Amino acid sequence: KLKLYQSATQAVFQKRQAGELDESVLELTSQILGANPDFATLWNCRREVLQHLETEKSPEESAALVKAELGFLESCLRVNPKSYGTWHHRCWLLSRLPEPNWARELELCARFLEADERNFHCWDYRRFVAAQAAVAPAEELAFTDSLITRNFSNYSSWHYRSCLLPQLHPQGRLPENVLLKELELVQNAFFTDPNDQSAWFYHRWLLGRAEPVLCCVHVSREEACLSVCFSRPLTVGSRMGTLLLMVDEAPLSVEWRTPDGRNRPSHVWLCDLPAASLNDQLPQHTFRVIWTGSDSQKECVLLKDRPECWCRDSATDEQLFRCELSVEKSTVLQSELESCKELQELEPENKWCLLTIILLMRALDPLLYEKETLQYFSTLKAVDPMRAAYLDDLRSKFLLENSVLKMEYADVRVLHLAHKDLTVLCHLEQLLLVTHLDLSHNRLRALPPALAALRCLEVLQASDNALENVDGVANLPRLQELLLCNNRLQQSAAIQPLVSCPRLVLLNLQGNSLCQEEGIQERLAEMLPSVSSILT
Amino acid sequence: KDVTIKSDPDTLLLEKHADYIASYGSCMSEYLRMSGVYWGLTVMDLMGQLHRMNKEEILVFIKSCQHECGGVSASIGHDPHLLYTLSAVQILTLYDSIHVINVDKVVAYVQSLQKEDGSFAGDIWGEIDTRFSFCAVATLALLGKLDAINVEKAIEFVLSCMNFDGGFGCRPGSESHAGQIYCCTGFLAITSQLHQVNSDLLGWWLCERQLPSGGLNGRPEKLPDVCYSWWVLASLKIIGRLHWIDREKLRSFILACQDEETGGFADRPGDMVDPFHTLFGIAGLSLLGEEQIKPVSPVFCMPEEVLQRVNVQPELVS
């Protein structure tokens, strides 16, 4: 069966088209609005008629029908807690009202929050009421510590804490003091219940920090080029700010571009250098880059007979892959780790635990737990097969970092990464100074555009991979040898991008299907006339 | 730990769906028919079956909804709202009859909804929602009018809706939700701000949405919905992490959600089917590569065809 509920509707339209901002409709609305609380149009007509007495009719009808609503709303929410329409009307109503009845709000909230600890509509409304009645952050920070102890799956709860704690205490994610505490509060959140993603996610976010920045300044004499690398991708010459160059303690206007000249947000930017900034009139030249908008400043000096000079921020000295745990912190984490291996014995198939065991090792001593970390990924890859791709790129990222750290420590520009089963490349913007890069024997399916940051790359050994795309090789100033034997370069069009490598002389491609095309050696010589030797 | 259990519908029933949507409209759904038509039309189109819908009637209906303020209402008589405004521009954009409505008003209606923080209210009754920061930017984009608003400010707002886990919520402080990540990553793509999104982080949170049944949910501790398949995959494609999902497991789930009888797709295997999920099911398969569904745009949820025509297609993440 079915009831003609539409009739009441067509009625409200008629009883409106003229200007009946009365109550004869304000009631008929509750009729449809009861079943279809998502019929936004109605919440309007109602929101209309009734504001036609909130400045008109006697306060003994208005202030009265006022509460008459706060009752109706609860009645709607009861049957439909999830509904942007309802909750909005309430926000609207409780906004207009002259008297701040907020007191009863923080209770109506706790009411629905208890019924459904996972109703974002309610937490959003509470956030509203809290902001209105100016509830102290600490006050709310307690409401969460309680909702967390009783509940088993409270993500909305931890999420909120992530917003509250920052605004209570302004390296680490939170102040050493607040941090070490919050950790303990979470360490048992998942020990009590490890099948609660919540605790696990929040826990990950607690091991990181934020970034302030000019992270490198390189100057090649032969290229008469000055290269600059930023912490994150920004756009020089626009809001964010721009770059100023000071050569020999005097400004020098330069144009700034990205490797592909499209000048979109990027880690790398560069400018050409005039003869004066590189000639012999002085025993040396001083370059000083100043990024406004953060004012990060970098400065390097180019001696009379040196081919290049730079000023880079060591990933190590900047703790980008670690965090240099303070004697105290270190101990709490070292304790955090051990406790987790136990949790694994009890909960062997808990992917979250295994994973967190890895993140903990990355936080303590990435290089030390290298053998271990790799063993856990194996374990993890087995218990959680659906995230094999994820784990792989993650293992790849960490593997890269360890290598970068070794290179910085060894103080060289050769980055070895052969036989690491790498599936992706990361932090390429840290590689700017690298001259030789070996990425052969891995599972890379592509060299990425981000590879453009490698302004000193002379040789690129990427043989034996699953490379199907080599687009990121484009625009590499110093690239002279590009080895790509045995890969998956199918068509010769996949080599098109290489015509942007002005110094490319050796191009080994043997092993790719593309060599099977007829006249491939001739087609390529046409396409890359500058490349002296092209083995195919 | 609450997931569903697939029984023993493993094959894409195109025609069966084609019939469902083509026969749909022939009750209480009216308060959103504009978007309803938009789902049915878009899905049919993705199935190279758009010719089975009354363009004329749809076009007349669209015009009948553009109220003298630019905004478009879900249905004739109802109120104008960004959502149905976008749904309509889309209907018209894929019907290339984008001349039926007053484009100048629509662009006015949109800017008339941006606040000083950059956000966008749903309608005149001020309902700030990143869900609407998308509708605005998407509507303008499909009209080459993305300049009408304060793009710099609208971006600052959307970025302030980023949570500790890489995702985005309804408004500053809100909880990371799948449907809200789509709108913000879609808006971030349209406005060339993807370099702000943290791909690795959000990408992880996003793949974790996939449960043992192969399906995906909208957030931690929830059941898979074929509709979150679209919303999660689309966000993943935009941020360039789509390879982090198990294409197969998901393909089986999505396929199971279809009624081998009535046609169309259902939220979950066994429940009722509707046009909303029929679109996102077909849409989801499209993003995973399917030789029977036209490539769908992971940003406007329309045929990548229609979008290459209007020459509107943000470059996604590398």
Binding site: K82, Y84 | S29, G179, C227, D274, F276
Partner: peptide, 4 residues
């Protein structure tokens, strides 16, 4: 047939 949607919700949130």
């Amino acid at each position: 047939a949607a919700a949130a």
